[PDB]
Amino acid sequence: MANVAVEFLVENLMQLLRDNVELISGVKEAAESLLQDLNDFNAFLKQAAKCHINENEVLRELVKKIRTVVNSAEDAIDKFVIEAKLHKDKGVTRVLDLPHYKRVKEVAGEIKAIRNKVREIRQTDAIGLQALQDDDLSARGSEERKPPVVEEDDVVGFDEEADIVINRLLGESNHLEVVPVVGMPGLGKTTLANKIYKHPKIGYEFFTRIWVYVSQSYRRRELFLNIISKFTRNTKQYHGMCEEDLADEIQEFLGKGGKYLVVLDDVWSDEAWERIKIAFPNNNKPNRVLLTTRDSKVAKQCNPIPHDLKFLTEDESWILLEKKVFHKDKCPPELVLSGKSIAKKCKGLPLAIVVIAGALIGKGKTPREWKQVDDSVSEHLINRDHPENCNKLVQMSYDRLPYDLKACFLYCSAFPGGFQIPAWKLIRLWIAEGFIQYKGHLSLECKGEDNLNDLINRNLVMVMERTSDGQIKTCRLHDMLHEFCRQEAMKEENLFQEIKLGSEQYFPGKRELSTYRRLCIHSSVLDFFSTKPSAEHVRSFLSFSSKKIEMPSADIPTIPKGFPLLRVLDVESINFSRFSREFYQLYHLRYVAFSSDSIKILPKLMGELWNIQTIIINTQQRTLDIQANIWNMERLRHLHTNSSAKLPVPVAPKNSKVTLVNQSLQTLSTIAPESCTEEVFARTPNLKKLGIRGKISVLLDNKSAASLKNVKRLEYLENLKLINDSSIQTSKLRLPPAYIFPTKLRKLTLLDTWLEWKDMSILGQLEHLEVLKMKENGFSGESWESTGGFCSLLVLWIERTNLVSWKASADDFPRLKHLVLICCDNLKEVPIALADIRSFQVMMLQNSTKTAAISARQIQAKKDNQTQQGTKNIAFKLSIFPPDL
Amino acid sequence: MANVAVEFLVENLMQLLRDNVELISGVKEAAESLLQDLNDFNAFLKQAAKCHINENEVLRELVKKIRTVVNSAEDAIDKFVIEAKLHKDKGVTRVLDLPHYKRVKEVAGEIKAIRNKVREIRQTDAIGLQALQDDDLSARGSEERKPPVVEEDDVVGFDEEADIVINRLLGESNHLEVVPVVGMPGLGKTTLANKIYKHPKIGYEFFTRIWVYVSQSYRRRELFLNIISKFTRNTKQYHGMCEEDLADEIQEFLGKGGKYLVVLDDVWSDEAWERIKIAFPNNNKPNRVLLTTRDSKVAKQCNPIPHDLKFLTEDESWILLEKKVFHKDKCPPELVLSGKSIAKKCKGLPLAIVVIAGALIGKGKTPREWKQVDDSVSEHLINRDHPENCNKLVQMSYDRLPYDLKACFLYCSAFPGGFQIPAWKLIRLWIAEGFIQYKGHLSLECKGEDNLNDLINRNLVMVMERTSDGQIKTCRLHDMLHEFCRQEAMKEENLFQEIKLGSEQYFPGKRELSTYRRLCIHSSVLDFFSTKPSAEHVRSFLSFSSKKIEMPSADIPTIPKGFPLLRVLDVESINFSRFSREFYQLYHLRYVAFSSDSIKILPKLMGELWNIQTIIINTQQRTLDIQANIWNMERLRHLHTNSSAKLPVPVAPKNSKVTLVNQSLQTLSTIAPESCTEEVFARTPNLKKLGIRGKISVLLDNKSAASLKNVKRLEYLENLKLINDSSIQTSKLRLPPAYIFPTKLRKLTLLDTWLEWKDMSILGQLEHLEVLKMKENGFSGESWESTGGFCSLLVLWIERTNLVSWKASADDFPRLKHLVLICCDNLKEVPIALADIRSFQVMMLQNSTKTAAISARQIQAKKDNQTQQGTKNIAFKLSIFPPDL
Numbered sequence A, B: 001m002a003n004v005a006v007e008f009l010v011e012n013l014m015q016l017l018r019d020n021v022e023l024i025s026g027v028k029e030a031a032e033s034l035l036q037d038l039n040d041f042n043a044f045l046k047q048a049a050k051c052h053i054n055e056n057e058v059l060r061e062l063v064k065k066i067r068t069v070v071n072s073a074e075d076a077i078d079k080f081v082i083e084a085k086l087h088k089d090k091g092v093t094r095v096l097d098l099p100h101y102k103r104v105k106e107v108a109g110e111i112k113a114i115r116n117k118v119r120e121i122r123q124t125d126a127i128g129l130q131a132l133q134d135d136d137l138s139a140r141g142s143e144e145r146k147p148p149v150v151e152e153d154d155v156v157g158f159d160e161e162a163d164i165v166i167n168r169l170l171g172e173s174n175h176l177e178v179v180p181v182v183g184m185p186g187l188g189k190t191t192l193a194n195k196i197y198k199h200p201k202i203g204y205e206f207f208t209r210i211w212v213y214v215s216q217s218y219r220r221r222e223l224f225l226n227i228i229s230k231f232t233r234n235t236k237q238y239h240g241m242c243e244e245d246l247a248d249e250i251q252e253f254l255g256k257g258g259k260y261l262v263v264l265d266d267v268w269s270d271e272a273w274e275r276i277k278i279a280f281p282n283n284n285k286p287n288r289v290l291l292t293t294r295d296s297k298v299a300k301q302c303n304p305i306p307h308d309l310k311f312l313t314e315d316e317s318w319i320l321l322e323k324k325v326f327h328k329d330k331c332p333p334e335l336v337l338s339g340k341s342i343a344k345k346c347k348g349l350p351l352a353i354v355v356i357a358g359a360l361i362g363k364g365k366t367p368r369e370w371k372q373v374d375d376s377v378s379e380h381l382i383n384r385d386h387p388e389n390c391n392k393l394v395q396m397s398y399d400r401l402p403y404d405l406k407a408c409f410l411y412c413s414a415f416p417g418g419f420q421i422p423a424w425k426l427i428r429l430w431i432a433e434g435f436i437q438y439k440g441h442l443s444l445e446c447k448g449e450d451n452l453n454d455l456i457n458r459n460l461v462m463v464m465e466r467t468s469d470g471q472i473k474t475c476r477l478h479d480m481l482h483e484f485c486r487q488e489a490m491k492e493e494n495l496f497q498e499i500k501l502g503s504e505q506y507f508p509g510k511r512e513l514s515t516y517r518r519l520c521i522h523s524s525v526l527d528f529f530s531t532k533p534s535a536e537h538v539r540s541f542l543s544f545s546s547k548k549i550e551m552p553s554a555d556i557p558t559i560p561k562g563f564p565l566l567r568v569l570d571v572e573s574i575n576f577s578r579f580s581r582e583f584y585q586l587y588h589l590r591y592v593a594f595s596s597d598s599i600k601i602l603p604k605l606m607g608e609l610w611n612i613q614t615i616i617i618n619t620q621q622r623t624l625d626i627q628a629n630i631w632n633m634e635r636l637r638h639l640h641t642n643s644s645a646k647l648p649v650p651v652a653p654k655n656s657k658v659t660l661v662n663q664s665l666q667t668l669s670t671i672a673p674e675s676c677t678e679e680v681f682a683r684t685p686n687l688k689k690l691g692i693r694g695k696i697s698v699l700l701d702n703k704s705a706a707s708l709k710n711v712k713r714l715e716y717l718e719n720l721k722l723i724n725d726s727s728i729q730t731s732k733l734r735l736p737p738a739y740i741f742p743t744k745l746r747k748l749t750l751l752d753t754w755l756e757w758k759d760m761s762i763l764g765q766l767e768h769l770e771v772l773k774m775k776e777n778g779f780s781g782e783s784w785e786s787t788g789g790f791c792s793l794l795v796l797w798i799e800r801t802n803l804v805s806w807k808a809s810a811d812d813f814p815r816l817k818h819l820v821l822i823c824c825d826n827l828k829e830v831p832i833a834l835a836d837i838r839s840f841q842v843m844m845l846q847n848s849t850k851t852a853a854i855s856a857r858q859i860q861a862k863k864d865n866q867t868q869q870g871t872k873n874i875a876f877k878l879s880i881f882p883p884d885l
């Protein structure tokens, strides 16, 4: 949406005027005129949005070029910014900088010419929104949206198919056979396969089960390395060996554990099936492979009897439609006729039903809205076979999105098709792109989380993973939606442009690269960098892939020189040996995601960049000394990393009344314990997620800075993580008193701490703690005797525990909702008083005593006894990794 | 041919028995058996070759499988060799190393099985040996072949096309037009193009001429950088510059220099011409482009008036065939009819005639052979349009070719098609693969050179550049011959397999890679080495790329582990930052060519590989401190490098009477002057080409080490090179007396020497020195006055000198034949006395004073009159750089 570009430019310009007079001292007047012009123009574009846009070209034509002048203004302004910073770099003390001052005055001439263009647009019409103001549509206030829990998990109308498939199971023993699930895109084949994968009979029958995603772009070795990843924790040996050895190892592993089931998802071509088939052992067992394909021919090749997936019936369609649109609540009678007509117009395609349900929830719940929806659906679903029917339906749903949401939804298409998107990264990207601007009380990250939740509610986005707490973790757009938004962003809005090379094609030339605004590459990135391409007007660079790629020491400086006006640099997949000096002249940089293996120091020159918000660094080093003055990059909102970052010692300038208090800071992922000192904590009042990695005993020790005591200061802290790297137990560690911890702390993690279970009472005292995950022998002992305290705790996560005996009362864990038991060989059995608690529903048993599993059956049995009685306690489901237990 | 494999196995086994008994001590008996049976198999194969194996099916089978046992015996014996050396590495001092001695003895059980399998078959060979020997053919001795000096430079019946083309040019001035050239493959279009590109009228009209090859698989940036390299020295900067901006610079450079002609060679597809035409400015000047293509459609697109090439007429065919077959000599009358009939049967295709001439040369000069050839060609040329007729003709020529030479043509195909093969590299490959076996007294390299000259004489291999002295420098296979050689070597004899991948295709799997003998990769290789491949029966790896590809720091150890039985490792085009341990365990290594940029120290462990002949290192460093005890690698025959290497100080073992005197050694290309010491020269008695790089002063200084004196010891030296890197003229340098230089010295080169033109008398005193090349101010001064001495000098080459006055008499340069005056911008004129030298044939004057060029034309006119005066004077040719002179 044009408003997004105009607003971003406006915000940048006001920030530039406020923060730095010198940068804009030269052209302050034209800049301010541009700022006022942009404000009024944004008002104009809003008025235009009020009237039908997709219908009238003339309103669109008036809109057209407002952006181009804005884009030119944005460009010219950025060019000026970099030029003036380069002037500073020269450090010329001359009053009249005879060299390059004329050039910067000519840049000021470009700025003035852009001012004249915007003035010309205002001249063509004093506003141009007279006709627009004449007609106003869709007048209404803004209401709230609700965070979604897992809803309508049950699949409407596909249970019979689940039973049919589960009947194909054990059709013939001692054999490997493939079951082809054939259906049109979005018909629910993947959902049906997922259902079959979670079915209790399937889980009980086959000891080992695997989920495998065979995209259209699968990569055999990557596919095999994943399958090997599940079975064995350490994969160092298998990395170095050939794909055929990988297949042989997979075959051995599958043969080890009795019988097995594997689901190959979205097998596009028969050849891929053939190539992948070699991994699975034909070990004379009743093993089965579930295959989800959209092509009939490939399904027939896999097996002459393909299980055709059937359409939903009208009753099923209406049930699904009302469930989706109204969630738990049922449909009001007055809307039932309209909803039934809409569902009957879906012909039984679940995706159509879900998309129209999203459209309905977006529009409202009035009879007129439903009548309009029914009319539009009838209009846009005359035909049946054409896949463009779903595109038209998606268009219908999309047009009703809020403008800011539309920009995020499109910016989702940019991530590779079929690639699961980290939610946190996606949020931080939007904040960098300026899509999301501070509104109301919610902080930007919170607003972005709300945006993603709304999109999930609309059914636009799918959730692939959910954290323990239930929050979304990884999102992937559906393929049809991904294609629709890809086309939209690439053509209609030119939000981003993607270079994907066919074999015969070649990289677009410099002239074409000049037009693109944002760049996303998923083909070979290295071949692109070999071309030495140059674009002055690419501000966003994105490359997402599974395989990590090195940067040849000759191609390193390609990026900063190729693009000098970068904001978003997402090169996480690209491994960098070092950084050229040209990187330290990307002043318009907001986001930096890069991976390195040798980088040990973050250099000082990184400090000079000022607009950066996020920083993500993957390095194999066990230490990452940060020498850049983070205390000066005021906009800094995150410093992510996985090493033991050692923050620089804060030092207030001897002759400054500026306090280096970065009020914007939110995260410090894995800073080193030595840095957990009073000053750094004092400098980050609003910190909201801390984590440490290194010698935790330094925190706990008195001699060092009493770091765990200093942690009391972060009044707002809500996520703590202690990681102990020392593989040597030099002594025992005793936590501090419960009052030292930040009051709001809601999520805590302990890894390799080896704490004494007598301290668990300390964590019990915490009032708000809601997610306690201790892993890698976080707490070491043999007898745990819970002493209550965890009033608010909702989930408990134990892994690699050497605990022999645990004793609990129903009062000890009142709110607990889910329990995870991993590598708990020592523990004999799980206290029954935990079975008493109603909240506790789901628990996972892995690598634990079979007696513990029988007592877990007893726990589920008490919950099932409540079920049989009808007494109301939250329903209970059991997961045990080894079925034998 | 099978004899080649058997002979190589026999030689390697004999060498293993002689040198190292411990490696063979385990299976000495099976080794000696194998040796005997292999000798008998070699004799049997020779006898079968005497007969026509193809004629009889029984024979085909009898020859078949003798090779398989030999290949099987090689694999087992090599595996034992490496395993036993690994045992030595273990250093298990136990009398019975029962653990893992039974593994190496498992390999030994394979060995013994093989020995028994050979004794079988030897028995099967015993039967029928008499039946084979009952028949024989082609009973004749071997005669001498002679060196291939340039001949038949003129092109038969093609001056009509040349004049037509030169007429087509200059049609429309102030405009840029491209003239198509069309015709079937091998029709001579490139020959005509090169003829035109050298015609004096062309060399007079257009100042700027450029010749460019456009393969089937060209790469635009590569050729643009090369085109720029013509006008300016360096290309490394533009390596950081985009293809389109490269094109802009090319256009500027080319437009600055008056008019221009450019020849694009072998254009295949329209898209390529479209993409490439950009660099040429249509700057409103009379400029032309000459493109050669085999397709009519591309030619028509480039211009509606393509120039069809004409077939050679029967008289033209006969004259060409006679010139090729009989060289300068005329045809004997008795063979005239057969020759005319054969030429008539070639239908005027120059390539067919050329290959037929090669075949006739191979057969001999008897009427029976000519009648047989006439019959055969009549047989194989009933059709005209079928391209396979030329394939049949080359097969006919090939059949008569000695198997040593036959092993080439097929190994020649390994180099990427269209690649310019460095002759020296090709010969050292030959030697390393073992295709050239000791037969007589000529040094191996000499035998290779004669093989290559014979290949050229039969016309199978076309030469591209000759060194100054005329010895070949760079050759290639013709396209038709290349496809014929590639198909044949891959299918019939399985000499090697190319891995190059097509679209929607995959790298062959480990099963396929188990049946390969040699790997040639000419396309993406980093992709191949990211597959983590594996093969045990691959002995050779060839990668003749275009760009220098780095090796990712994580993907380095793929080659040593992918192939542990390597001999030839030609990875010159792959930049390695370091070497893995698994590389040092490679023991079957003869040839090792590789590049680098940061490698400063050759590792010590690299000196353990006992079996290496060649070594090539294109390290960018200025210094390459060698620490491998080259003195210990008894088969070392070359140590090529480009930086200034520092050979380890020799130390005769304290307790061994074994002298570390290498007598195979031939070259120490670029050792450091510090390492031109007495001992380093005692240890290389048969050294035959030495070069130095560094501060030449330390040599010419007698206080440090009388090093240019020590050069006196190398009684056989025949190529010296003194390269000075010190850019600071600290002092003047004085050559030692002429009696110090080795007597046979036939080539000398001096760069940055800054010697006083007075010393030139010393170089005059040398009696055999035949080619003197002084580049980048070899001698410093302004007045040179010849005093004689250069009795045998044949080529004089001066580049980048400040010589002003040159004075000489005709008696100072009696034998001179070639004179090159490059970048002599201060010289005034050249002594006209040179006009009197009979041998003086060719002189080239580049970028020099116009007065010198006037004197050059005076010399040219004088020699014209001399030849006109009835004297049997050889033809003279004058090359002057700028057309105005």
Ligand SMILES: O=P(O)(O)O[C@H]1[C@H](OP(=O)(O)O)[C@@H](OP(=O)(O)O)[C@H](OP(=O)(O)O)[C@@H](OP(=O)(O)O)[C@H]1OP(=O)(O)O
Pocket: B424, B467, B468, B473, B669, B691, B719, B747
């Ligand atoms: O053909 P090359 O193998 O490349 O070597 C010859 C020359 O030695 P010779 O004249 O005795 O053959 C130099 O020796 P090397 O460097 O190969 O050891 C070489 O020097 P540079 O490659 O460093 O330049 C030179 O190179 P170039 O062809 O570029 O002049 C080249 O000269 P010629 O081929 O004319 O003899």
Ligand SMILES: O=P(O)(O)O[C@H]1[C@H](OP(=O)(O)O)[C@H](OP(=O)(O)O)[C@@H](OP(=O)(O)O)[C@@H](OP(=O)(O)O)[C@H]1OP(=O)(O)O
Pocket: A422, A424, A466, A467, A468, A469, A472, A473, A669, A691, A719, A721, A747, A749
């Ligand atoms: O398994 P991981 O991918 O490594 O993620 C877990 C954790 O997952 P859960 O929230 O589901 O327990 C969080 O991952 P995200 O959802 O943020 O992607 C995050 O920890 P927080 O919840 O505290 O943010 C992360 O971070 P870290 O590696 O710093 O602990 C932590 O990793 P671990 O599994 O290694 O603990």
Ligand SMILES: Nc1ncnc2c1ncn2[C@@H]1O[C@H](COP(=O)(O)OP(=O)(O)O)[C@@H](O)[C@H]1O
Pocket: A154, A155, A156, A157, A158, A185, A186, A187, A188, A189, A190, A191, A320, A350, A351, A354, A355, A459, A462, A478
């Ligand atoms: N019976 C069903 N109930 C709910 N959603 C369904 C059903 N069948 C298909 N779907 C669709 O599947 C989505 C989630 O599964 P998904 O992986 O997208 O499968 P598919 O795209 O094959 O339908 C739902 O949001 C909905 O759009």
Ligand SMILES: Nc1ncnc2c1ncn2[C@@H]1O[C@H](COP(=O)(O)OP(=O)(O)O)[C@@H](O)[C@H]1O
Pocket: B155, B156, B157, B158, B184, B185, B186, B187, B188, B189, B190, B191, B312, B320, B350, B351, B354, B462, B478
């Ligand atoms: N009169 C001639 N005209 C053309 N080619 C000739 C002639 N005499 C000999 N030849 C040889 O025949 C071949 C002509 O085809 P060639 O130039 O190899 O193929 P292409 O033109 O496709 O590159 C060359 O080897 C050339 O030297």
